[PDB]
């Protein structure tokens, strides 16, 4: 029912981002590897399987992205913990 590609791309990217962030203290790297994944979800024409993925996880992923934007504006590290909570929850649903 849900796009295999979107599921595999978020699994791979979330795993990479966690290694960049928790493993390497690389916040910029973390934002960079997830940025085109968020932009995918947002942009036009979508298939049935990817619409289904976006229905299941889109709100949480959008909210995770917004916490990252908040972090950039404010420097509040708790904005990143909020984002990682949401990313982890999605990571678990798709694994």
């Amino acid at each position: 029912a849900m796009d295999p590609e979107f599921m595999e791309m978020w699994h791979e990217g979330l795993e990479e981002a966690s290694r960049l962030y928790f493993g390497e203290r690389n916040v910029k790297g973390m934002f960079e590897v997830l940025e085109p994944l968020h932009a995918m979800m947002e942009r036009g024409p979508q298939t049935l399987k990817e619409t289904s993925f976006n229905q299941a996880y889109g709100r949480d992923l959008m909210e995770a992205q917004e916490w990252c934007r908040k972090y950039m504006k404010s420097g509040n590290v708790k904005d990143l913990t909020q984002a990682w909570d949401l990313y982890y929850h999605v990571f678990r649903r798709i694994s």
Binding site: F22, R25, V77, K78, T81, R92
Partner: protein, 132 residues
């Protein structure tokens, strides 16, 4: 000011639950669980927790109530202290773990929250655990 320190209590009274007895992970039981069984390697585990530096500075406050924190045990998903510590717990149990840097984040730490060579204090409640 003249009250008990939970961190000092685990440092000065906690059992050493490392197999070598190198003092790397010290444990005090706050509330005894009901379970017979402890979680096994590969189990999915659900907890509440909070974490403090041994100097009292909190680094994790938001996971102690509401939605559980989930992880897979014995996989190296979490620091070594938790793989050792949570494996000793029964369902419903609350304990305090004092984790030396060799069983936590070492000399690299996990900045900004965790400085290098930091000894960490956790309170953990084991909520439940599953084989699959």
């Amino acid at each position: 000011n003249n009250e008990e320190s939970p961190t000092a209590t685990v440092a000065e009274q906690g059992e050493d639950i490392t197999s070598k007895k190198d003092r790397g992970v010290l444990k005090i039981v706050k509330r005894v669980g009901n379970g017979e069984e402890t979680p096994m390697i590969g189990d999915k585990v659900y907890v509440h927790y909070k974490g403090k530096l041994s100097n009292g500075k909190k680094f994790d406050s938001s996971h102690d109530r509401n939605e559980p924190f989930v992880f897979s045990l014995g996989k190296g998903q979490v620091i070594k202290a938790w793989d050792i510590g949570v494996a000793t717990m029964k369902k419903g149990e609350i304990c305090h773990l004092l984790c030396k840097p060799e069983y936590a984040y070492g000399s690299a730490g996990s900045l900004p929250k965790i400085p290098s060579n930091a000894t960490l204090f956790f309170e953990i409640e084991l909520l439940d655990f599953k084989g699959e």
